Symmetry: C6
Subunit: 144 residues, 6 copies
Amino acid sequence: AQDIFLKIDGINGESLDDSHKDEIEVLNWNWEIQQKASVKDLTFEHAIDRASPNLMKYALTGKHVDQAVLVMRKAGGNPLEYLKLTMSDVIITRVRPSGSRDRSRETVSLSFAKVKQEYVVQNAQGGSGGAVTTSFDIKGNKET
Amino acid sequence: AQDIFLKIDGINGESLDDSHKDEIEVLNWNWEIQQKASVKDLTFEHAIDRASPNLMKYALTGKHVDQAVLVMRKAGGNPLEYLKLTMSDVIITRVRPSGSRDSRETVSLSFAKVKQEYVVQNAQGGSGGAVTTSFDIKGNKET
Amino acid sequence: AQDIFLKIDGINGESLDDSHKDEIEVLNWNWEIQQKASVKDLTFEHAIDRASPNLMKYALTGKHVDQAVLVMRKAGGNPLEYLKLTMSDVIITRVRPSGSRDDRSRETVSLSFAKVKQEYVVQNAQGGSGGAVTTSFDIKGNKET
Amino acid sequence: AQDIFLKIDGINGESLDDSHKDEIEVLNWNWEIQQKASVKDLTFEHAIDRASPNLMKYALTGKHVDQAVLVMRKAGGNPLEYLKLTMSDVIITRVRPSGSRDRSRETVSLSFAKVKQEYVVQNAQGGSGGAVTTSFDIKGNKET
Amino acid sequence: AQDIFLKIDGINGESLDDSHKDEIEVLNWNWEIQQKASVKDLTFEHAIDRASPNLMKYALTGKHVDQAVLVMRKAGGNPLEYLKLTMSDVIITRVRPSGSRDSRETVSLSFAKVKQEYVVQNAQGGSGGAVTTSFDIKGNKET
Amino acid sequence: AQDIFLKIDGINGESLDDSHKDEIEVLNWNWEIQQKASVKDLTFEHAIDRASPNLMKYALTGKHVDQAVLVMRKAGGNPLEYLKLTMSDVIITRVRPSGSRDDRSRETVSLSFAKVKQEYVVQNAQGGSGGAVTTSFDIKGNKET
């Protein structure tokens, strides 16, 4: 059971994690690019939490935020942050809260002008094996 | 197992909860906002109950009600009311009753304005603070 | 396990229940109203039974019947009839029978109606009738009643 | 586990049942009428059997057959034929055979000019409790 | 557990069955005719095997083959070949290979003419007779 | 449990397999040709890995790569590489990453290509290479090769 965090400028979550205080604890996420290219929103799920009233507001106003950063960190003896997705000039495009007597979930989508992806390689001994980083100005349709 | 309540002006439920007497006991609910913005109906499910004949009536007439308030309350030793969604100038847009031998009703609401309050819980289980936003959907303005 | 009954004027079922003799025993049902308003057919499922050949006939002719009454009754020690849906000026709009060798033969049926009344019966502490909440509407005439 | 039979004029099945010799043994079936009225095909499933090559032929040619009769008969100590659906002037509109290493099924549809439905009521003692029969000339849009 | 074989002219499989050497072993299949008549492709599934590279080629070229023959054979003590479907002037219309770590390929065929033979089994498990029909789909005539 | 590998020129994976070092370990894949002919993208799934940031980049730029080779190898005592699909002049048309707290992070990727070759390796009785059946096609040029 790995940890997934999302840090959205101006929209705090309620994580108690030492390295990700006040970020949003993410249950799951997905994203898509299709063939210039068609870049879909990134979508994530979290519990209804401290971020939710602000996520609602930004969805309605459409106001941009500077940056959102998504991180996946492996669980266990060697807890590496192995994937980091950095989104610049972000819009909250969709919010879908729900609740049940038997559970509170809220599904959120984000669009962004630029993106950067960093992946860290872990070796069998658990240390850093290398790293790959790429980035792209989607709005400007240019490599960065 | 948390409790969810909905208080609709002019349409009583039959809850026996001390702090929510005659409100509607909600089984589940969902809502959506999409990118001015497209705000979807809020939908909830409840058992067929004392509210149902009036929900049917309002669905048919289209008459507005002043306010509906949805509350989620945590279960357990510290039963905190941590989410409050206040809907102003409400229409009953849809009612979908059903029953089986082996009985539930799905209802949708639309509203001119909305307020969402999340109540932050402190380490002792009490109120530590809140985050609150509101919006005039009809007028397309922050409030 | 609650009981659900449907009484359709001129189309008997084969229920043996004392208070609902010759009515249709309903397995399940559903209905919908959408925003003047759009009122959908009411749909129910029952076993292929004595009603089925007449339901077929009425589906084909389109002939109206005066009234259909749907009732749900709680199971157990206090069998309260807690929901009564009365549909006036009714058409059989859909019939969908089926069967399988591996038991079960069922039929899905839909109804349309000019007027509707919904009564919910409130239960008292002794399990008896404590009162009711009732509403009604002339759908065809688009008026509250 | 009840028995279901279909007797199609000119298209024999391979049933060994005393009362339904050479009829088609039916696995399941369904039918539909919608609001003059829109009468859908009746559809049934059977194993690929002696009828299948003829069902294929009639589906391709579109030649009519005089009559098809579907019967459901209860299983057990009191085996009543409680539902009989009689279809007149029948067309084979669809045939969908399939097979598997893990099974042979074939789905068939029928359309018809006229229909008759007979239902027999069974009492708790297992005997005949009464009967209801209706019929309709669909092509002519008239009660019969 | 019955056996299903497909013999396609010019496209060998790798079956080791004595009576169907070098034919394709079929996992499942289906076909459809709808109401002159609309005859759909016949579709079958097999493991990725020796046929696959040629199935890919014919799918791409659209070149016809003379004949494909599908046979179902009963399992057990009396392994009767009870269904034979003969397809004449065949096109490979579709190939859908796939594989997973935890490998199958779906193929579709179209044809100008068809013959279906069902072999009737006698009480001793032998051939008791047959029912046979055929049709020129392309020419829209019985044969 | 068989192994599936994909070698994409200029986009390394992180496989540790001796005969497929730094290739992409594939969880599953599928492809389609329909009736000149309509050749669909090949789609595969892999874990989010060293390839992923480059796959994203190439999806966005649309830049071609020379070749991608997909291989399936039987598991067990005789690990035969029995299927080899060689795709020439390749575009990354689709990337779909996802992750969940409850383990697993996976990514679905699609490829398009101008030419294709499919080799199936026939296995001999000893489990070794007995031969092959091989075909190839210039999809862009619409010609058999």
